[PDB]
Amino acid sequence: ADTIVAVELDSYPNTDIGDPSYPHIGIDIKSIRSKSTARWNMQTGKVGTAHISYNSVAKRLTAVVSYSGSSSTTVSYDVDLTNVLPEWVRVGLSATTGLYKETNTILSWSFTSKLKTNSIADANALHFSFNQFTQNPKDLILQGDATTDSDGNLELTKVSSSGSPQGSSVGRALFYAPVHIWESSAVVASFDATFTFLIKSPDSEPADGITFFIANTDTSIPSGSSGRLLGLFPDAN
Amino acid sequence: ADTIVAVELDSYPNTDIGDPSYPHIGIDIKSIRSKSTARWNMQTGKVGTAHISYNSVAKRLTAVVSYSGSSSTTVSYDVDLTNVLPEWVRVGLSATTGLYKETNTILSWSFTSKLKTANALHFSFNQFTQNPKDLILQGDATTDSDGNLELTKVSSSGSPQGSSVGRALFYAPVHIWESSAVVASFDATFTFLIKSPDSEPADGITFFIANTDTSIPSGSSGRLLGLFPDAN
Amino acid sequence: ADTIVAVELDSYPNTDIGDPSYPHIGIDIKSIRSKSTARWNMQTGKVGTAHISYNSVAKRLTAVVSYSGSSSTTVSYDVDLTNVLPEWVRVGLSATTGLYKETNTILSWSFTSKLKTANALHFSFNQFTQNPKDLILQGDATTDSDGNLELTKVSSSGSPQGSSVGRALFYAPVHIWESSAVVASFDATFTFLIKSPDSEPADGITFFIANTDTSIPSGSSGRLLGLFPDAN
Amino acid sequence: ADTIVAVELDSYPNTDIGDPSYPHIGIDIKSIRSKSTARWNMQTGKVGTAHISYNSVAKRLTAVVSYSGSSSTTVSYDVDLTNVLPEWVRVGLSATTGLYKETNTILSWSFTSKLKTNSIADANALHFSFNQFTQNPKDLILQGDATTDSDGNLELTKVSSSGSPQGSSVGRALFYAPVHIWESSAVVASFDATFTFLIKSPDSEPADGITFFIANTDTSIPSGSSGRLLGLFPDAN
Ligand SMILES: [Ca+2]
Ligand SMILES: [Ca+2]
Ligand SMILES: [Ca+2]
Ligand SMILES: [Ca+2]
Ligand SMILES: [Mn+2]
Ligand SMILES: [Mn+2]
Ligand SMILES: [Mn+2]
Ligand SMILES: [Mn+2]
Numbered sequence: 001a002d003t004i005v006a007v008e009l010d011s012y013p014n015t016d017i018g019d020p021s022y023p024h025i026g027i028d029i030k031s032i033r034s035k036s037t038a039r040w041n042m043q044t045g046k047v048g049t050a051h052i053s054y055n056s057v058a059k060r061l062t063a064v065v066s067y068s069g070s071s072s073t074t075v076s077y078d079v080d081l082t083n084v085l086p087e088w089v090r091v092g093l094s095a096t097t098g099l100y101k102e103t104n105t106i107l108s109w110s111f112t113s114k115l116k117t118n119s120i121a122d123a124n125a126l127h128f129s130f131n132q133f134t135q136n137p138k139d140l141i142l143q144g145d146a147t148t149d150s151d152g153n154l155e156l157t158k159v160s161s162s163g164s165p166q167g168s169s170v171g172r173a174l175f176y177a178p179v180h181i182w183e184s185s186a187v188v189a190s191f192d193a194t195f196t197f198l199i200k201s202p203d204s205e206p207a208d209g210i211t212f213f214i215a216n217t218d219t220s221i222p223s224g225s226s227g228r229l230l231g232l233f234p235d236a237n
Numbered sequence: 238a239d240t241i242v243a244v245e246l247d248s249y250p251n252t253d254i255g256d257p258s259y260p261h262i263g264i265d266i267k268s269i270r271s272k273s274t275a276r277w278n279m280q281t282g283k284v285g286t287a288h289i290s291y292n293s294v295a296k297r298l299t300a301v302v303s304y305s306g307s308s309s310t311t312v313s314y315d316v317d318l319t320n321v322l323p324e325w326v327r328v329g330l331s332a333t334t335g336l337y338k339e340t341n342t343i344l345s346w347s348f349t350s351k352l353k354t355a356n357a358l359h360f361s362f363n364q365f366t367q368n369p370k371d372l373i374l375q376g377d378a379t380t381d382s383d384g385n386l387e388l389t390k391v392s393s394s395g396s397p398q399g400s401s402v403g404r405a406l407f408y409a410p411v412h413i414w415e416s417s418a419v420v421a422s423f424d425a426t427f428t429f430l431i432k433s434p435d436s437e438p439a440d441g442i443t444f445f446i447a448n449t450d451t452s453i454p455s456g457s458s459g460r461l462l463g464l465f466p467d468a469n
Numbered sequence: 470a471d472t473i474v475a476v477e478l479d480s481y482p483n484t485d486i487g488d489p490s491y492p493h494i495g496i497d498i499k500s501i502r503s504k505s506t507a508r509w510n511m512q513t514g515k516v517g518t519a520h521i522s523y524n525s526v527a528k529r530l531t532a533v534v535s536y537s538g539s540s541s542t543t544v545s546y547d548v549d550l551t552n553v554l555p556e557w558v559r560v561g562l563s564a565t566t567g568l569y570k571e572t573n574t575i576l577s578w579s580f581t582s583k584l585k586t587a588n589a590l591h592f593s594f595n596q597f598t599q600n601p602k603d604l605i606l607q608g609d610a611t612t613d614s615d616g617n618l619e620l621t622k623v624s625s626s627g628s629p630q631g632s633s634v635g636r637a638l639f640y641a642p643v644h645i646w647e648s649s650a651v652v653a654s655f656d657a658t659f660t661f662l663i664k665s666p667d668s669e670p671a672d673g674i675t676f677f678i679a680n681t682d683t684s685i686p687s688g689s690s691g692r693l694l695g696l697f698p699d700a701n
Numbered sequence: 702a703d704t705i706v707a708v709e710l711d712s713y714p715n716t717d718i719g720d721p722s723y724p725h726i727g728i729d730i731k732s733i734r735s736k737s738t739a740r741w742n743m744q745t746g747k748v749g750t751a752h753i754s755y756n757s758v759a760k761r762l763t764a765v766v767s768y769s770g771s772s773s774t775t776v777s778y779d780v781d782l783t784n785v786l787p788e789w790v791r792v793g794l795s796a797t798t799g800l801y802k803e804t805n806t807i808l809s810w811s812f813t814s815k816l817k818t819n820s821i822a823d824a825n826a827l828h829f830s831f832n833q834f835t836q837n838p839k840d841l842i843l844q845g846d847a848t849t850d851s852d853g854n855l856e857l858t859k860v861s862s863s864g865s866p867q868g869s870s871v872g873r874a875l876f877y878a879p880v881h882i883w884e885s886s887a888v889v890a891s892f893d894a895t896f897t898f899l900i901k902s903p904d905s906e907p908a909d910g911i912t913f914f915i916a917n918t919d920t921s922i923p924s925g926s927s928g929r930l931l932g933l934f935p936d937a938n
Contacts, residue, residue, distance in 0.1 A: 055290045064294045076295050088837075118286075118306060121345065127827070127829070129822070131825065132824055188301050347589070354595060408641035411603070518820060545760075579821040
């Protein structure tokens with residue numbers, strides 16, 4: 001199986017598999033069942049911003065999700081990611097819809113990682129920033145249903161021509177370049193990511209959610225990972 | 238008094254004022270008596286790197302110090318800096334020598350702060366000019382002909398003097414919190430070369446963040462690392 | 470006098486002092502009489518973005534100014550900043566109104582300078598604090614709520630006043646060049662909102678780089694864009 | 702064929718293909734016959750640094766190669782790269798040896814590209830920085846003889862176990878992610894690249910050279926590109 005660490009923006013409470021009973025954000029380490037969650041006062045139709053950060057010293061993976069004009073939801077979880085993830089990962093966004101649906105539209109996404117090893121000055125680094133997405137985002141690995149639309153947005157899950165979300169969709173976008181997040185001599189590794197996202201839905205209870213995730217580089221959408229498993233895991237273990 | 242948060246690289250154990258009894262790195266929050274420390278296996282005469290990180294979501298200030306080929310030392314401390322520091326600060330490096338001495342040479346120093354929403358401030362020196370107009374040099378701090386920042390006095394032959402204190406603040410105030418940023422974060426790194434003729438060098442060097450008008454407190458020499466007026 | 474290099478977004482032709490006869494962007498080196506200009510199809514009431522860059526290897530200072538959905542205006546001029554500016558500078562935005570007027574509202578401003586192979590400075594404001602401690606506001610410049618930098622005076626409803634001059638300098642000096650640097654470069658962008666009820670708005674705004682102690686020169690009102698004491 | 706733009710550090714004068722009669726740096730636009738050259742006081746055995754910059758408003762591609770105790774050499778070329786390169790490219794370093802040889806060791810390599818538009822927020826940025834190269838650099842595409850060695854260096858051309866450069870070698874390393882180097886509606890696109898390199902040679906006249914280059918994303922070492930073609934071009938046209 002893949003090895004996944006993710007920050008989930010989980011619209012739909014699958015109490016069935018451990019979600020809290022409300023939309024929430026969560027930090028997922030090798031399981032869809034979040035190690036930590038926070039209630040998320042999700043607002044459809046309004047652009048949200050997620051900022052996710054980690055450094056290997058603090059070993060604290062944190063996420064905050066906010067919309068202008070509203071209180072942010074924060075969740076953090078202490079985890080030494082280097083003991084969970086391989087040295088090389090890819091980073092990506094995933095989203096699914098299921099029986100209930102929503103757009104999982106990413107309007108921008110940036111990411112910066114640094115890997116500082118003891119014997120070198122400066123920290124290898126990788127940064128990418130998209131304030132919009134091309135038609136052909138050659139630097140993204142689009143998995144599943146993910147595509148970019150006319151408007152320059154990355155629709156992780158299928159939307160119609162007019163942008164209306166489809167059910168039972170799963171899509172991910174990984175940044176093309178593997179990211180080096182640890183190494184034998186590493187002193188400190190960190191990464192920060194932000195994305196903005198627009199979740200719209202005609203459903204009164206939208207689903208399923210959007211994640212930023214980090215994975216083995218050859219990560220692919222697991223079989224059976226649709227819907228509540230957020231395109232990340234093959235089961236709800 | 239100033240409001241100080243610092244990561245100290247404390248070479249000299251003043252067990253007196255609650256240092257652990259070995260060189261250590263520490264997170265200091267409004268006191269020289271670190272809120273968290275970790276044994277620092279110093280390597281006098283070798284270039285060290287320190288990296289210090291915080292973000293307001295994680296609320297964990299951490300530092301790691303390392304040398305080439307060496308195991309690192311880390312220390313972290315849960316702290317919400319927005320409850321501690323004013324929203325505008327200056328960041329700086331400080332160092333002292335005391336009865337024992339050491340060079341407190343900073344070879345490089347970078348800092349990035351973000352207040353996201355995305356104000357950012359980043360500087361990086363891999364060398365310091367003779368006249369570093371973007372530093373506020375306080376106390377004994379100078380830059381030398383190598384473009385190194387000598388936080389404490391060293392003789393013309395690079396020999397460190399005792400009873401020295403010096404700091405260098407970055408010139409621009411840093412906006413580290415604001416009533417509506419969603420997250421504020423900063424990271425700092427510096428490389429330093431502590432050499433000493435002494436069996437147990439002293440006293441230490443720090444990266445610190447302070448009220449913008451921070452200045453070396455009177456009495457802050459030696460074990461007070463140029464940061465605090467007393468050991469409270 | 471100060472030493473000024475500037476990219477001017479000059480709304481108002483003062484052909485008397487060598488403006489071309491249309492709104493134009495310009496590269497000014499030590500004189501309001503731009504060394505190079507390009508026609509600027511202003512779009513009053515629309516947010517514009519200006520990107521200015523320079524690299525000491527290319528020795529070309531360039532600026533482009535665009536509004537969303539419209540063709541950009543670009544102007545470049547070969548210049549060796551190290552023969553023009555002191556090595557330490559402050560960078561800033563200036564703007565003026567004179568007989569005619571416009572808002573010179575800066576909504577965001579970022580800047581990055583590097584000296585390789587040594588220094589970097591970067592700052593970015595997506596909004597400006599009510600009290601931007603890291604800006605030196607000169608003349609009439611203020612920040613409003615809405616978090617904008619109003620370089621020139623606007624009424625409490627935001628209507629621009631004439632005969633205003635305002636500048637904002639980033640607080641830290643920037644080491645814009647240095648003799649042993651292999652490359653010096655910098656990049657700046659700002660977005661601005663010029664609105665005016667005048668059918669011939671004026672006068673303009675600039676991003677400029679100056680000796681660190683630069684101040685609004687006397688008589689630099691209006692067509693002098695807050696940068697120069699005369700039109701030489 | 703590939704579309705190549707490169708800054709060559711050309712140790713070896715192939716005057717038969719228009720090289721000047723001395724080591725030189727050059728800006729190559731779709732040809733090994735550089736559009737502009739500058740005499741390069743190559744400092745064998747010393748680490749050099751190259752800085753390359755371009756931006757589409759200035760439209761000047763420039764490079765400086767310096768060492769810490771002689772050269773600078775600078776070369777620039779006015780070129781609108783949106784008219785030369787595809788909008789998506791990979792960026793890389795290449796180097797070759799021929800009959801004569803030299804190490805083409807890269808000690809560090811950084812690159813930043815931006816596509817800027819109507820915000821202080823890039824429409825896109827890509828930055829990477831390697832101050833050392835891992836033994837399995839998953840974010841590099843190593844082509845030809847390029848490998849990383851045990852010192853953390855990227856040896857673009859073959860070096861023996863003793864570190865002795867071999868002749869007839871070509872190697873390139875591309876950053877893994879395509880870079881959107883321009884785009885129809887970007888207001889400004891720019892890139893900067895820096896790398897440090899160490900050319901050592903036991904030859905009286907080391908050869909052949911090393912480049913930083915930008916190419917179609919699917920660029921490969923042209924057959925017939927060894928030696929004076931620097932791994933970039935299929936011929937000397
Ligand atoms: Ca769920
Ligand atoms: Ca002590
Ligand atoms: Ca004018
Ligand atoms: Ca040649
Ligand atoms: Mn969940
Ligand atoms: Mn201590
Ligand atoms: Mn003018
Ligand atoms: Mn050549």
